[PDB]
Design a protein around this ligand. Structure first.
Ligand code: NI
Length: 341
């Protein structure tokens, strides 16, 4: 049955609640972004109204075959009326098409649901700055102080410099990047741009990327692997066996692989700077795990909450154990006492 933290009080709404069947009393289903733990349950047989961003709506129509008459895309940063309730969609700084949702309840309560997000000071100047928020439904994925990671900009600098150096020393090296969902496109797009190549990938992945409104995409991606020296593979194939096999398929065009796995966090972060990251190597294959995150660090999350000053926080991640829940509630209290709200 649907957990309470997916239900919006005083409305007929649910958020990312598609795996529970017909939710009793739900008149509109919101979807924050196209990731499977959030869309699980949607298909061409869905006949309730789904509200989402334009990009998410393109993916629902093209990848899951949801019929168009049930997709309700909304522009960003624009006040809209849904079933008599004012709502706004805000950029979540997560993956393409990902949004936060502001609900203005008929009784005066204002609720922000962050979906999945990476908090940023640029959010302090959106339509959030314009009224008080009473309740915050918060993406708490990395809500513990051990979760530090560098900026996305530093991580991409590392990846570009590493790839450019490797291929300049050996023009017969292939670069491979792993993927399993949308998000983190900058990784493979920035490397292809510094090497003067398109990114080669499967027809199914090319289709997914063509749904995203990324400017000049026909210019950066392709299905012709033969013409490309940056290849995208499923995340599961980024290991020594899967990469040795791939190199066999390239028919002696290449004699070395440099591969990237853009993970969220890994405990190398507590001890090591980005500057100091080294690969795992076997023979002519090297694999780099780089800490490219599309969720808030602990400090980014703290700064956002201390700025917003909500009256009540509802975590949406790590809610399944008492130890996790008690840990998070203790941080929330600290933040409130330190800031004075
Ligand atoms: Ni997500």
């Amino acid at each position: 049955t649907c957990p309470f933290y997916k239900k919006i009080p005083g409305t007929g709404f649910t958020v990312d609640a598609f795996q529970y069947g017909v939710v009793e009393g739900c008149t509109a289903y919101f979807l924050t972004h196209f990731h499977s733990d959030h869309y699980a349950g949607l298909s061409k047989h869905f006949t309730f109204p789904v509200y989402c961003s334009e990009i998410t709506g393109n993916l629902l129509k093209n990848k899951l075959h949801v019929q168009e008459q049930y997709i309700h895309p909304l522009p960003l940063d624009t006040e809209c009326i849904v079933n008599g309730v004012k709502v706004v969609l805000l950029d979540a700084n997560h993956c393409p098409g990902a949004v936060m949702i502001l609900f203005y309840l008929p009784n005066g309560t204002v609720i922000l649901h962050t979906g999945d997000f990476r908090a940023d000071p640029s959010m302090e100047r959106s339509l959030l700055a314009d009224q008080k928020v009473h309740m915050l439904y918060l993406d708490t994925t990395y809500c513990s102080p051990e979760y530090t990671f560098p900026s996305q900009q530093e991580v991409i600098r590392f990846a570009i410099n590493t790839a450019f150096e490797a291929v300049t020393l050996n023009p017969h090296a292939l670069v491979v990047c792993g993927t399993y969902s949308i998000g983190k496109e900058k990784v493979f797009l920035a490397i292809a741009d510094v090497l003067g190549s398109k990114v080669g990938m499967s027809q199914e992945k090319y289709k997914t990327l063509q749904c995203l409104n990324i400017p000049e995409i026909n210019s950066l991606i392709t299905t012709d692997m033969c013409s490309s020296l940056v290849h995208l593979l499923p995340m599961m194939q980024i290991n020594f066996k899967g990469l040795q096999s791939h190199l066999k398929k390239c028919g002696g065009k290449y004699n070395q692989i440099l591969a990237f796995r853009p993970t969220g966090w890994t405990h190398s972060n507590k001890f090591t700077r980005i500057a100091d990251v080294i690969p795992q190597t076997k023979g002519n294959i090297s694999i780099y795990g780089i800490p490219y995150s599309e969720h808030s660090s602990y400090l980014e999350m703290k700064r956002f909450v201390q700025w917003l000053k909500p009256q009540k926080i509802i975590p949406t991640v790590n809610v399944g154990t008492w130890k996790s829940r008690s840990t998070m509630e203790k941080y929330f209290r600290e933040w409130k006492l330190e800031a004075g709200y």
